């Protein structure tokens, strides 16, 4: 039968999670531009909720130009059921992709999107084969 190394499976997820976190950060950054200009916190809160509730992200953060946090949606801490020694073998530095929020040519802040590796950890742990 055919296999792939754990490292190759890891590389696929790193690529796909970083691409997804970046894609949402960029597209959400475009959508947030007018509510951020207007300082409309409820609308910005509503947009992040719409994307966050529908997705699988660990966190979405909106900052202004000075780094002051305007919106922060975070996942509550999750239980596992997966030993740390195994996680240490496959973990990669925490993914957080950003994109600038623009008022024309002027930078107006930043949106930061972090992926949730818990699916990656569980899939590799349940089906890991030692040879």
């Amino acid at each position: 039968t055919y296999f792939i190394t754990m490292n190759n499976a890891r590389n696929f997820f790193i690529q796909q999670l970083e691409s997804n976190a970046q894609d949402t950060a960029t597209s959400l950054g475009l959508s947030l531009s007018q509510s951020l200009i207007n300082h409309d916190v409820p609308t910005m809160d509503s947009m992040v909720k719409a994307v966050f509730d529908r997705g699988y992200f660990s966190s979405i953060k909106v900052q202004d130009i000075k780094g002051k946090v305007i919106i922060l949606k975070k996942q509550l801490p999750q239980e596992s059921d997966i030993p740390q020694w195994f996680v240490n073998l496959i973990k990669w530095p925490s993914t957080e992709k950003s994109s600038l929020i623009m008022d024309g040519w002027m930078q107006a802040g930043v949106v930061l999107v972090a992926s949730d590796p818990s699916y990656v950890y569980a899939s590799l742990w349940r089906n890991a084969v030692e040879m």
Binding site: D40, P42, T43, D45, S46, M47, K49, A50, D53, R54, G55, Y56, L76
Partner: protein
């Protein structure tokens, strides 16, 4: 896709404890679903919207569930007799779907509530795809054309689907409660 309310009550009692006054409210819900199948679609919207606005007290999730955000199943909403913005929308959605309203006509809509100055959620009804929707709300009882609700500003809308995320977790809880999938 019939619902077995005796088995649902049995399973929900194990999940949440003795339902207390929640059982009577679940009974009232069962009666609504049993007696409103053959009325007009506009009447289905009215009776479902009015039923949950009267059966549920509006209380924030942090107070009722000790969680900032917690999406109730319709059974959880009726058990507590209480919930917040999305709980009303979810309960009205599944009721209208069970009564025969097509899923294409119903959307979960994220809005800004201007008077409360906060993010908010309503259920919207589209009689046709290009129609002005009606707003089924928890803030007021009347069902009005959306643009007449000058106190609301729409942000984004979703067509409800699924078989971990917020909506999927609701479906998971309903499967444990005994609803068919």
């Amino acid at each position: 896709a019939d619902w077995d309310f005796s088995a649902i009550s049995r399973k929900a009692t194990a999940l949440y404890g003795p339902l207390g006054a929640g059982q009577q409210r679940i009974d009232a819900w069962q009666n609504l679903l049993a007696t409103q199948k053959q009325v007009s679609e506009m009447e289905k919207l009215k009776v479902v919207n009015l039923f949950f606005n009267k059966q549920m007290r509006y209380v924030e999730d942090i107070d009722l569930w000790h969680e900032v955000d917690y999406w109730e199943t319709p059974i959880e909403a009726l058990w507590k007799g209480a919930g917040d913005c999305e709980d009303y929308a979810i309960a009205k959605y599944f009721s209208l779907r069970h009564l025969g309203v097509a899923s294409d006509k119903l959307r979960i809509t994220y809005v800004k509530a201007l008077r409360q100055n906060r993010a908010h959620m309503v259920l919207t009804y589209y009689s046709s795809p290009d129609a002005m929707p009606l707003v089924l709300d928890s803030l007021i009882d009347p069902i009005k054309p959306a643009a007449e609700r000058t106190d609301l500003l729409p942000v984004y809308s979703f067509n409800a689907e699924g078989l971990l995320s917020r909506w999927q977790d609701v479906l998971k809880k309903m499967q444990a409660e005994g609803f068919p999938v």
